[PDB]
């Protein structure tokens, strides 16, 4: 009867944490944000349509110049576009046709990809010899690579379907540290602006906050009902949003250790694939499976407008790192850039 | 102006080359026919792929590109990665026949089949059904210690259909059981009734004739019925 006493003490501990969190709830952001003026019906229009793909787009990423963007599709092609003049700077054929993720280096050097082939392939773009070659291929997961992002040009963190996260180093090619403690598939992650720590979504409806240098989980947030598809930080780093398959977006604060607010509406039955903020931190953009992109407000929770468009589900969403535009990938192979 | 114009011309040529090669890629790509091989557990799905990593297999018949993918290297928490395959023309679903006794992974396989058939993104993908381990099924049934009727009582009420194609040297009960499993998979497929996708059963590997020929005929059928139904002739 050891497992019983252990589970009892664990449940009790959980209860104490629940109550300690419930005690900090003296007001709501919904209560105090009454005086803040609303957004108004402020709408975007398609300034550019980037078409080049044969199959469905699974992901994209903006570069730090806000100019280039990488997009990967399930045909095994990786296209590096240019936002202004709608060209194609590079096309890199992949080894595996199926690719679920892509990432951009902050200095513009490397481009990463990954998918059901379990291996995170790093591609160099600065080759004086010419075209692109596989620079370093990183393999340590027993499951598919769901997402990954560059810390810098040297070390890169990955998320996977073997329940774990791992921080790699490109030069040795090994795992510097291994993050375990999630329950199901780790669907997505987002770094910090100061990159000391990063959150992750999982299939147990709980987002965890880890610390990159030490490797430990500081806080576990359980607010959603089903699988968390995407997670994105806030401009100052003190909050983050998670989309899920419970058709709700939620805002969580790190210093409050609990879910502050839920954005939902009753006419939604389908999941949220992707989220992001703007430059200022006022707008929360979310793609859904009802083929639209709903633009919510971060303070008043009323949708200011909507983004029409894609004929099938929206897989990915990104915002330029100066906040100049928004980009939405779908399963109809088309990218739409908005303003 | 002075050198941005050259950038335009450089990027133009790069765009041309990429555009060209990409156009050459579209032909082979769209001509390639993608297939998803999956099986529940102890399914004999490693034999067909014996008939890139170890996962992926591209095999060629009659100058018609087939590109199979095996998912055997992943965990069985399936609901996130199976959405990645909605363009695959057919899902080859291979199930063992004598696993009714011990557990009942035959019932598990049936469950998985129903789940795939009703899944909201995979409402367009026809399932080619391979019923495997025919001789082994026959052995277990004639041995009789392992009774199907324990795990399927309604088998007592199901008799041999009118379209029976008996091969000689076989128990009519064994044949009836065989057709009963086949019908158990068919009725699930006929429950939807929209006719967007169909399940083609087969019997396999008691005779080791090349099941690619069946795969061939059925793939032809799937695409032919796609155009046929879209043109409202069906």
């Amino acid at each position: 009867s050891e497992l019983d006493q252990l589970r009892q003490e664990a449940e009790q501990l959980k209860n104490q944490i629940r109550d300690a969190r419930k005690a900090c709830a003296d007001a709501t952001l919904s209560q105090i944000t009454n005086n803040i003026d609303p957004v108004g019906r402020i709408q975007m229009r398609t300034r550019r349509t980037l078409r080049g793909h044969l199959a469905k787009i699974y992901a994209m990423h903006w570069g730090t110049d806000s100019r280039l963007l990488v997009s990967a599709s399930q045909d095994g092609k990786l296209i590096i576009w240019d936002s202004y003049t709608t060209n194609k700077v590079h096309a890199i054929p992949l080894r595996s046709s199926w690719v679920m993720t892509c990432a951009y280096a902050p200095s513009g050097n490397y481009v990463a990809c990954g998918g059901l082939d379990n291996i995170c392939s790093i591609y160099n773009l600065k080759t004086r010899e010419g075209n692109v070659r596989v620079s370093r291929e990183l393999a340590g997961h027993t499951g598919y690579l769901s997402c990954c992002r560059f810390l810098d040009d040297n070390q890169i963190v990955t998320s996977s379907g073997d329940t774990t996260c791992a921080l790699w180093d490109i030069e040795t090619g090994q795992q510097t540290t291994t993050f375990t403690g999630h329950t199901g598939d780790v669907m997505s992650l987002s770094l910090a602006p100061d990159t000391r720590l990063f959150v992750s979504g999982a299939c147990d409806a709980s987002a965890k906050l880890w610390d990159v240098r030490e490797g430990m989980c500081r806080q576990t947030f359980t607010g959603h009902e089903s699988d968390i598809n995407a997670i994105c930080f806030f401009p100052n780093g003190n909050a983050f949003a998670t989309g899920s398959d419970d058709a709700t977006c939620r805002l969580f604060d790190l210093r409050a250790d609990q879910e502050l607010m839920t954005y939902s509406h009753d006419n939604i039955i389908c999941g949220i694939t992707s989220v992001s903020f703007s430059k200022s931190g006022r707008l929360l953009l979310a793609g859904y499976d009802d083929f639209n992109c709903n633009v919510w407000d971060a303070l008043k929770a009323d949708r200011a407008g909507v983004l029409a468009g894609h004929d099938n589900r929206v897989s990915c969403l990104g915002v330029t790192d100066d906040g100049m535009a928004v980009a939405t990938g779908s399963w109809d192979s088309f990218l739409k850039i908005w303003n | 102006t002075e050198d941005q114009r050259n950038e335009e011309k450089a990027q133009r040529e790069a765009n041309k080359k990429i555009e060209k090669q990409l156009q050459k890629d579209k032909q082979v790509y769209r001509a390639t026919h993608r297939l998803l091989l999956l099986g529940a557990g102890e399914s004999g799905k490693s034999t067909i792929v014996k008939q890139s990593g170890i996962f992926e297999t591209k095999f060629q018949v009659d100058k018609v590109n087939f590109h199979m993918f095996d998912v055997g290297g992943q965990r069985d928490e399936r609901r996130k990665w199976i959405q990645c395959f909605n363009d695959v023309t057919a899902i080859i679903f291979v199930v063992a026949s004598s696993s009714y006794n011990m557990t009942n992974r035959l019932q598990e396989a049936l469950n998985l089949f129903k789940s795939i058939w009703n899944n909201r993104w995979l409402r367009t993908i026809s399932v080619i059904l391979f019923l495997n381990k025919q001789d082994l099924l026959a052995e277990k049934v004639l041995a009789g210690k392992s009774k199907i009727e324990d795990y399927f009582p309604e088998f007592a009420r199901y008799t041999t259909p009118e379209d029976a194609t008996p091969e000689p040297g076989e128990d009519p009960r064994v044949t009836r059981a065989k057709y009963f499993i086949r019908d158990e998979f068919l009725r699930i497929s006929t429950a939807s009734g929209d006719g967007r996708h169909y399940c083609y059963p087969h019997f396999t590997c008691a005779v080791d004739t090349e099941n690619i020929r069946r795969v061939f005929n059925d793939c032809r059928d799937i695409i032919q019925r796609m155009h046929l139904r879209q043109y409202e002739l069906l």
Partner: nanobody
Amino acid sequence: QVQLQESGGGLVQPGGSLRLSCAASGFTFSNYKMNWVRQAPGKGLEWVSDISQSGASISYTGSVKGRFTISRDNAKNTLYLQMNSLKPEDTAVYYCARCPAPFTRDCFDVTSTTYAYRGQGTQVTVSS
């Protein structure tokens, strides 16, 4: 958070009856397809019975046709499994697991542990 607590269960004579209950909370219980999944001692799991949103669509594994009655109470967020006329093959741990997706017909749950939408289970054992 999400938890599903298996209650009931215990040592009962074969041919007897036992009513399994599952109390759910933390989610809008009305929408989610619930089902009962078992794990036999020393053998892998097998799905047993499911119940749909409205309480209409109900399937059983063929071994337990009709003698098991699954009923849902949406009015207070609680689930019920009525077992009648037990068999010696029924002795196992009965978990109540929900299907992960809202508003659907498909489920992927018999897949083994560290799946969060499943409870700890109760012990049902067939008497001697």
